[PDB]
């Protein structure tokens, strides 16, 4: 599978040994054939587990999640999906890798979709080989794939708020449970309910993942309350998954604003990945998967695919050519290649608003395309009254870089900048000119 012009999907079931067994064999063969190779990990947590599976082998780890002394003799680089896309966007030269390996290639974050688009286009061009490793490739319709040991699948009503009665099965469990919730705010409510009932709960989300995941190995716990981030290779020593089967969906309305629609059903790929956290030990059959809804193709019209197109339009490929999205996921957005291509100075602003401003791709694009410079924050306060960001049922206020107290009222409203307390605190720091 290492020959040029070939894109291979390694779709072995969850827990089949794609990372610990297959990946080191591919790396040895790539080193033997002198292929300049890139290994892409979804998160810093997967990069650390990859270093254990590849230990000894000459790999250059382009992440601070691993503390290794690189000899300078490595032809295999390892980095996160977001780092690969970020380096493509930045002026820095990225080697034209002969072999491109993506682990957890089902990741739907905009930078992962862009990385898939770029790589598959290089393969279509006949310039590279690629391997996409995932049990759930784009287009999967099977929510119940094979596992290392039989799983008990039970369709049941799953609580999405605190409860006083009616769900005895949840707390009448003596093992360890991983519970997938549609949002951080929904997880806070359930974790509070479980804590009041005497349970030890750990909460996981995109912004707290590396730090809080370590607690699942360093201490005893009864529940792990997590968003969809734990569908990306996160592994637990648990015997039950409780799955609300719901997620939030970012949606662009009238090309003017972004709302977080839902909670709505997850895709079959997400349901299979959430279920896949258990049934992994062949010596422990009978792990349970309790699910509270059906699946649907909620990736169609989801803002991440439009955001991936804004990223690929601003990545150099060859002269005026622009990378297409990976074919099985290209119909998820109505977008023409090149429509988001920015001129030099606006593109640099777009990259900085994402890299340093920490803004969502769509919002970074609106600011940069309007000809606004990175440090100009007047747009955070000159929007209509209905764009007022609310905190504790009262309009959010910040002190501007001028020393003036003003109501946070962005010219373009993206619900992701205030989806939880941590997001709004970061957006207030941005509006104030603190980064
Ligand atoms: N992939 S690797 O680092 O083992 C390698 C590949 C081709 C030549 C030399 C070499 O290593 C040596 F420099 F130590």
UniProtKB/Swiss-Prot annotation:
Highest taxon of the lineage: Viruses
Lumenal side: 1-435
Protein name (record): Serine protease NS3
Subunit composition and interactions: Forms a heterodimer with NS2B. Interacts with NS4B. Interacts with unphosphorylated RNA-directed RNA polymerase NS5; this interaction stimulates RNA-directed RNA polymerase NS5 guanylyltransferase activity. Interacts with non-structural protein 2A. Interacts with host SHFL; this interaction promotes NS3 degradation via a lysosome-dependent pathway. Interacts with host CEP63; this interaction disorganizes the centrosome and inhibits host innate immune response.
Protein location: Host cytoplasm; Host endoplasmic reticulum membrane
Membrane topology: Peripheral membrane protein
Residues with N6-acetyllysine modification: 207
Locus of motif DEAH box: 103-106
Shown chain mapped onto the complete sequence: 1681 to 2115 of 3419
Organism: Zika virus (ZIKV)
Binding residue positions for ATP: 12-19
Record region (Important for RNA-binding): 3-6
Annotated ranges, domain Helicase ATP-binding: 1-155
Domain Helicase C-terminal residues, every copy: 150-329
Leader sequence residues: none
Annotated site location: Involved in NS3 ATPase and RTPase activities: 274, 277
Post-translational modification: Acetylated by host KAT5. Acetylation modulates NS3 RNA-binding and unwinding activities and plays an important positive role for viral replication.
Known role: Displays three enzymatic activities: serine protease, NTPase and RNA helicase. NS3 serine protease, in association with NS2B, performs its autocleavage and cleaves the polyprotein at dibasic sites in the cytoplasm: C-prM, NS2A-NS2B, NS2B-NS3, NS3-NS4A, NS4A-2K and NS4B-NS5. NS3 RNA helicase binds RNA and unwinds dsRNA in the 3' to 5' direction. Leads to translation arrest when expressed ex vivo. Disrupts host centrosome organization in a CEP63-dependent manner to degrade host TBK1 and inhibits innate immune response. Inhibits the integrated stress response (ISR) in the infected cell.
């Amino acid at each position: 599978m290492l020959k040029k012009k070939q894109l291979t999907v390694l779709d072995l079931h969850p827990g089949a040994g794609k990372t610990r067994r297959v990946l080191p064999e591919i790396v040895r063969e790539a080193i033997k054939k002198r292929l300049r190779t890139v290994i892409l990990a979804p998160t810093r947590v997967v990069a650390a587990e990859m270093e254990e599976a590849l230990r000894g082998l000459p790999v250059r780890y382009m992440t601070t999640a691993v503390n290794v002394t690189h000899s300078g003799t490595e032809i295999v680089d390892l980095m996160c999906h977001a780092t690969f896309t970020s380096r493509l966007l930045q002026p820095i030269r990225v080697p034209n890798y002969n072999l491109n390996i993506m682990d957890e290639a089902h990741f739907t974050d905009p930078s992962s979709i862009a990385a898939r688009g770029y790589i598959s286009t290089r393969v279509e061009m006949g310039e590279a080989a690629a391997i996409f490793m995932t049990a759930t490739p784009p287009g999967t319709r099977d929510a119940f794939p094979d596992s290392n040991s039989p799983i008990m699948d039970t369709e049941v009503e799953v609580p999405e708020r605190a409860w006083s009665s009616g769900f005895d099965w949840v707390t009448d469990h003596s093992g360890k449970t991983v519970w997938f919730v549609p949002s951080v705010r929904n997880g806070n409510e359930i974790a509070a309910c479980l804590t009041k009932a005497g349970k030890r709960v750990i909460q996981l989300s995109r912004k707290t993942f590396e730090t809080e995941f370590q607690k699942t190995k360093n201490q005893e716990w009864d529940f792990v309350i997590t968003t969809d981030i734990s569908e990306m290779g996160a592994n637990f020593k648990a015997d039950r998954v409780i799955d609300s089967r719901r997620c939030l969906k970012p949606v662009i309305l009238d090309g003017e604003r972004v709302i977080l629609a839902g909670p709505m059903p997850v895709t079959h790929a997400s349901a299979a990945q959430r279920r896949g956290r258990i049934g992994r030990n062949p010596n422990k059959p009978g792990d349970e998967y309790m699910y509270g809804g059906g699946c649907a193709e909620t990736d169609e019209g989801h803002a991440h695919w439009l955001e991936a197109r804004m990223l690929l339009d601003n990545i150099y490929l060859q002269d005026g050519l622009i990378a297409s999205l990976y074919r099985p996921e290209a119909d998820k957005v109505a977008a023409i290649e090149g429509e988001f291509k920015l001129r030099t100075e606006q593109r640099k602003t777009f990259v900085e608003l994402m890299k340093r401003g920490d803004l969502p791709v769509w919002l970074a694009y609106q600011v940069a395309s309007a000809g606004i410079t990175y440090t100009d924050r007047r747009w955070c306060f000159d929007g209509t009254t209905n764009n007022t960001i609310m905190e504790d049922s009262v309009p959010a206020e910040v002190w501007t870089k001028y020393g003036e107290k003003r109501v946070l009222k962005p010219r373009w409203m993206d619900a992701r900048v205030c989806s939880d307390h941590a997001a709004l605190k970061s957006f207030k720091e941005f509006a104030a000119g603190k980064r």
